[PDB]
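Hey, weird one. I pasted the Esterase/lipase sequence into the form twice and got a warning about non-standard characters only the second time. First submission, copied straight from the form history:
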Amino acid sequence: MAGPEIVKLKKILREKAVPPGTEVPLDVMRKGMEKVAFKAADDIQVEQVTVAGCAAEWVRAPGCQAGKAILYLHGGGYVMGSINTHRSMVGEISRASQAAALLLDYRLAPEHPFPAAVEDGVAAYRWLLDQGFKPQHLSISGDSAGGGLVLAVLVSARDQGLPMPASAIPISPWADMTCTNDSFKTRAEADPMGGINKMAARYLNGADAKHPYASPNFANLKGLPPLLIHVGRDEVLLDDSIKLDAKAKADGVKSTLEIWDDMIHVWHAFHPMLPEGKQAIVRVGEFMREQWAA
């Protein structure tokens, strides 16, 4: 029916979770994500760089193709996450896609609200182009909030005349800051991963929640490059993804959406103990490579 590992992981996550309602202070949520992050695989090579005034790492699995690069935008509700929280998952995407990842430590809210993260994303992309990477050798990817930022970065880039990269992969994207979608009710019980509305509040700091660079589900997608959208069936953000796919299709974008049954928010991040995490990462890699061969 459902795999044994997901059933197991669902139980561990329900057990470890803080109870519904209780307010976890920000720097406490921040530290907890750091402290619990998976260590990247031993064969992942890392190089610290500065990119548009942000800390970054080049994240190079074995097998990287010369000339290829992923701008990777991490999750964390726009308020948390770092190079550290995501080095592990991004190592595996680099493995699968045989491409080095640029892992950006973009400005986080509330210290730096919207559109700070979009400016960092766009500049990061401009930096890659400036470094000599060709549009057709580039891909943009990210998870959760980062996966919304993927879209925002594209839209914003398109608007400023930048060429589109060959592909983009939003993973469990948060692309609608209103958080009104049916799936917050429909998929609530199945999702072990209020809390989210606070992050939107902190990121927006008063801005219009239907701003296209905050909620790319209200943006004009015309001209974006081909998309692979990943989302699990068992997450409150199911609707962001279904609606992002229909938007893209309507705006004439080549969109492939895959709902993975039984899966949770960014199940990729649990690749060390979830076969489906590895499987979905492999597939992100295959899709990036497919798009580079075309």
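That's the output from the first submission. The warning seems to come from a hidden character in my clipboard, not from the data itself. The chain has one domain: 1-294.
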